Symmetry: C4
């Protein structure tokens, strides 16, 4: 609610081409299809193949930034991105060689930030997951066995065994309800009463395990990335030690590309930003082009008024962002700083028009 995401978050075309790349699978998979478009898209495989292969060697030029790097992840698939189709094309002379479009599916995951954010936490919290997973196996066979006791008599063809009953366990436990093989007797139908009660109690924790400290990591991701952009601000030699741990939990940083809009004049002013790198276009008779290490919005927050200036992203600006309360927290947190923001809320009234 308090950030401006711009400049092509889903940027690199190395990721993009999997989506059209893998829909190219389908038409080969289908009888009664004409040969025209059949092979037209086989080229598209060769495009993407060639396209990453074009990209490939430029990556294999890993002399760029060659000091200390850990690029086993990034490179691992690029190699197989082109070999696996290639080795496939010959030995699998039959059309099923296209089935090695299971390969690019990592290419999104290759340059997928936020995916290592996932695997980072599992190796602290899987301690619970396994005791639950065991418990998930406890309750499976603890319950799955209860049915073979019963309907083996009058449902041999369905419940004439244990693992057939294990099938109806997770289906019945995992919220699903396929609807293939269901009891007829009473006591077995009694047993289902606890199952949904159970699995929804089970998953009530287990899926909760994920979001539990995942959110901590992401709420922590908003600090590790943001203890940066702190000392750059020339004012923050006076902030107390504990002051900062409060604030940075809310301060998310995102970038704006050049040319785009930041805050349009007259829109309801609801936030203020801290510029730390780049430059802006504060639309005034003298454009107050504040570069690295600046801010604006106190003209709008202290007064609670619309924007006093159409700020447009002159350049690639690494922005922070902040809603009022936590800035009211700040002006509450210290009178010493509202003084300059009091002055600045007067200086920028005269320094907007003037220089």
């Amino acid at each position: 609610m308090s950030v401006l995401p711009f400049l092509r978050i889903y940027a690199p075309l190395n990721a993009v081409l999997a989506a059209p790349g893998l829909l190219a699978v389908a038409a080969l998979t289908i009888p009664d299809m004409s040969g025209r478009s059949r092979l037209a898209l086989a080229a598209l495989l060769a495009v993407i193949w060639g396209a990453y292969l074009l990209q490939l060697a430029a990556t294999l030029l890993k002399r760029r930034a060659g000091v200390v790097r850990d690029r086993t992840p990034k490179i691992a698939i690029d190699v197989l991105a082109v070999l696996v189709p290639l080795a496939a094309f010959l030995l699998d002379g039959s059309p099923d060689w296209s089935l090695y479009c299971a390969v690019w599916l990592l290419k999104p995951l290759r340059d997928s930030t936020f995916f290592p954010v996932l695997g980072r936490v599992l190796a602290n919290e899987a301690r619970n997951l396994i005791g639950v997973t065991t418990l998930f196996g406890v309750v499976l066979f603890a319950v799955a066995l209860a049915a073979y006791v019963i309907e083996r008599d009058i449902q041999p063809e369905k419940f004439g065994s244990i693992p057939q009953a294990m099938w109806w366990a997770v289906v019945t436990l995992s919220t699903t309800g396929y609807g293939d093989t269901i009891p007829q007797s009473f006591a077995g139908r009694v047993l289902a009463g606890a199952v949904m009660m159970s699995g929804i109690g089970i998953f009530g924790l287990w899926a909760g395990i994920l979001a539990t400290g995942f959110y901590q990591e992401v709420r922590r991701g908003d600090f590790v990335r943001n203890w940066q952009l702190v000392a750059a601000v020339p004012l923050f030699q006076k902030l107390g030690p504990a002051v900062l741990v409060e604030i940075v939990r809310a301060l998310r940083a995102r970038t704006v590309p050049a040319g785009a809009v930041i805050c349009r004049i007259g829109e309801p002013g609801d936030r203020m930003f801290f510029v730390v790198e780049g430059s802006v276009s504060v639309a005034t008779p003298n454009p107050v082009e504040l570069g690295p290490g600046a801010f604006f919005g106190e003209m709008a927050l202290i007064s609670g008024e619309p924007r006093s200036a159409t700020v447009s992203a002159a350049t690639t600006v690494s922005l922070l962002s902040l809603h009022s309360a936590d800035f009211q927290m700040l002006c509450s947190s210290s009178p010493e700083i509202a003084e300059i923001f009091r002055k600045t809320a007067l200086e920028r009234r005269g320094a907007a028009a003037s220089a």
Copy 2:
């Protein structure tokens, strides 16, 4: 638990008429129906059409409050509220013109506050949603492909292709369990074991993403709307800076219409209010009609007793509300203020009967 919502929250009839408006669709949709009621409700379309159209021009008189406004949202549908049916009536000479009752469905959403509250946050947090959505696409085809490996042989008519297998993917992943095409072999039935385990882990985050900071926004909505009604209270020149950030998280404000009841005498006193605008009917021999900038309940909270007065909403009062603990927090937070509430818990004993 600590607020009095009254005065027609679901007020404007511009919203109301969609509900009866769109049930008017149905009877036309149905064979073997008599023509009597068939066309009776076609009028009702013309009513609502005419009714908004009656409303319409009064809105197009946008000279009301014409200083600085952003009414592209509000007006966008009102225009189409009446044109789309109208242009429909002629070219679609066949009865299917009524199918342009897809149009009013925004009219609730037109004057739906709390809906922009939704879209506000997605443009900070969709960063995650897409990495998950990709991941949702990862796991779809990563898993959907695994089945065509198998049952293409003995289930051509069902699993004789990939996207047919993609169908059984999300159905099997998204908790649903339709029950149309299900395996027969073992290894494919093995694969389902992880699926529900997965999707319930997937959605265990992804739906959690929504409530995650949504609740922050709404818990923030209770501050942005409520840093108002602060300075109006004549007492709050002495409250510390950080005192307020604690409190306003709990203080929700709602309005009471005139005539209605606020706190009935003798009911178990469980809360106290801060009046800031309007007037009341404190039912006493001298009605202590406290107007803008007042409160009551300390007579009941300090003593923990029932109500000492039937307070009824004399007028349209913009109320705050507060349960004890956070008022006990207050009386704990400062002895200087309990003094006047000590006195007031004596003055209002004598000032209830007297003037």
Copy 3:
């Protein structure tokens, strides 16, 4: 994890008899049944009827504690508890009069504390629920309509109308998957992709709305009930104002009946209690029978040792409970109090054996 619930939480037999009471419904509902047990349980209705009716008049003696009370809830059903069966017995001469066993179902809810805890909060937070409920209606027909566009042609008997399509909406949205009427075409099967994605995003908030501040109320329920049992403790004239708001969030109170065990000797000591009313049996050569306003466990917590005494509930004791950390919080929160607990951890070593 830190409380001792005892003394028949599910106590009153006025609640109990619904469960056997309503299973008495069934055998009448069933053909090919013998008349013997058919009417045997019709008596059991008359038992419970007579049993509450026996209870009834003793309740209608509402001279007990007759000062200020709000007993419209409690009495409302008791009246109908016996009239509704009675008026049923005659006019409904056919056996279906037993269908007025829909009546006792409130009798649990009659003396169901924790149920008003539910309805208390909905009248603060249903503001959201309705904007969501509208939104739930938005997305219903916004999506339900999309299908009649398509399969009316080749599925008249199933999708030959709108509300038939509304049926497949919520079924498909609400996680369920019945499996009666499913598409065959592509584009309609495309549409389901967003649905589960939606409804699981929808309910991802909406059910979250419930637990959101419900937990606040219950986490608040642990304070409102527990700002009691504070001043009774003779030591708590020195605790700071803000000290208490920290602590009582964790301190839950429950009662122990007489005779039962409290802490058995030698078990791993993990907590300490504050007695405020009743008496104990501290099993020592001189039983240190501490009555109202006492505590024990610091002998075990400071040393981190097993229990030094088999404490058994001599009487009906209203207990508090506390795990270490928040007592370590206390001994951390003030050195002035650890002094007496230092002394007490010596006095009770000598005062356990001695008097």
Copy 4:
């Protein structure tokens, strides 16, 4: 995200053998199977039987650590681990004696820590669960009854009774959607509209009840286990009282086995550890083998640089772990301690190479 789990968390083979043990059930359960492998695995039962029985007596030697112990849980199944199969083998002369493989399923749960963590909390919070469970029974029959009103006429074979309708209740309430018996009329199909709305509101709390304070216990589990490893650190005589309650919520402890890696040189330094027991291999010209009561990473955190030393687990080290922010919290929390970490960030530069 901030811990190193190693040394065989899922260690004891007493747990392990259930998994292969119980898959041994299946092949006996199946007709048309050869007798060869039929009996081969019956031995495997005798293996595990004999294997625990081998383990058994060594456990019955409970003279180890015989001071004060509560081993009724641990021993209860071991006894039946071998008797139940044994008594089964004779009286159940038919092959169904193998059905007493319901017995080992506790053996995981025997030495399952984190399972008592489950049952600990239910006896504080089941107060709610039962009022909900009653409410779950309220809404069951409150709703289940509504259908027999209707479809008993034209669905006797399906809805010709109440409990048959109770079947379609929980199936329809508990998110499942089997798909066996579904209405045809309107008003009954109206009723389902609230059901999913209800049960997803129901379970929206009820499963939430579990994770609610479960997470508290586990977030409390990270303190009770970790008020240990506090005084051992020679520095922590100066930490304030309240300082610690902040920190230990994040500090999780895990063990590393001997030989394994701790922090490899050059990897991106993201955390620092507190050694309290064991020894390391700080790979330097003079290996700075810090034993009980040590730490490292401030060389990497203050500078925000990669690792300055390949630390490998020389021995079984009981490690703590800590990411920056909470160490930045520390260096923020007190200048007095950053002094020695300032010096140490210089001493270990010279004391890494030197001794």
